[PDB]
Every structure is written in C-alpha cells, then in structure tokens.
Amino acid sequence: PPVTTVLIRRPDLRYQLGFSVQNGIICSLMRGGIAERGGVRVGHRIIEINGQSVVATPHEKIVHILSNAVGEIHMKTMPA
C-alpha cells in the first residue's frame, strides 16, 4: 500500500500549493511550493482529500478546495 499523505501548509489564500490536479492525477510540480513538503507526487493519483474522494471528482473541483484550502491540506494519493 504505497499511499502517500499530502500535508500541505497554507498560511493564506494567495499562496499557491505548487502543482496541478486533473480529476485524480497530478500534472506538474514546482520545486519550491509547500506541496513538496506535504506529499504531492506529480504522477500519483490523489483521492481522499480531507475526506473528499476526488478519485471520481472533476479537476476544477479539486483545484477549488486547494484554491480555498486555508491552513493545512491533508489528502491521500495512490500510484497512477
């Protein structure tokens, strides 16, 4: 079970995480964002984000949470 837990740190709302989401898979990653610390691995398959299984959720929706996810984002990701 190579499941990684992305614990991102968001102090504000204008602080990008450092990656893009596509329904359930990641696209790119910026070596500097807080997403690196959390767990976000460009190439995995996010799913249970703070309790919401994005596995079958649109991309815009996932970006929304993270777009308005102040504090600390906690999600799970599998190997895609």
Side-chain angles (χ1 to χ4, degrees), residues 20-55:
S20 339
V21 60
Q22 201 190 309
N23 213 286
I25 308 302
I26 298 71
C27 269
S28 312
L29 223 150
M30 252 201 271
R31 58 247 191 181
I34 330 99
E36 66 197 21
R37 272 155 149 164
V40 140
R41 264 208 139 288
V42 61
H44 287 188
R45 175 180 256 281
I46 291 148
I47 41 130
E48 288 147 46
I49 328 191
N50 314 292
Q52 57 135 352
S53 319
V54 296
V55 69

Side-chain angles (χ1 to χ4, degrees), residues 2-74:
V3 64
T4 281
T5 317
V6 183
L7 209 188
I8 313 141
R9 343 258 266 281
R10 224 158 115 79
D12 221 51
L13 302 139
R14 67 163 233 81
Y15 268 116
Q16 66 263 293
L17 287 56
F19 70 100
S20 339
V21 60
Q22 201 190 309
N23 213 286
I25 308 302
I26 298 71
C27 269
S28 312
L29 223 150
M30 252 201 271
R31 58 247 191 181
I34 330 99
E36 66 197 21
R37 272 155 149 164
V40 140
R41 264 208 139 288
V42 61
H44 287 188
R45 175 180 256 281
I46 291 148
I47 41 130
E48 288 147 46
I49 328 191
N50 314 292
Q52 57 135 352
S53 319
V54 296
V55 69
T57 306
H59 63 109
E60 270 231 296
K61 229 248 212 265
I62 314 155
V63 170
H64 249 134
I65 293 89
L66 298 197
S67 170
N68 301 255
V70 285
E72 303 192 319
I73 281 66
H74 50 291

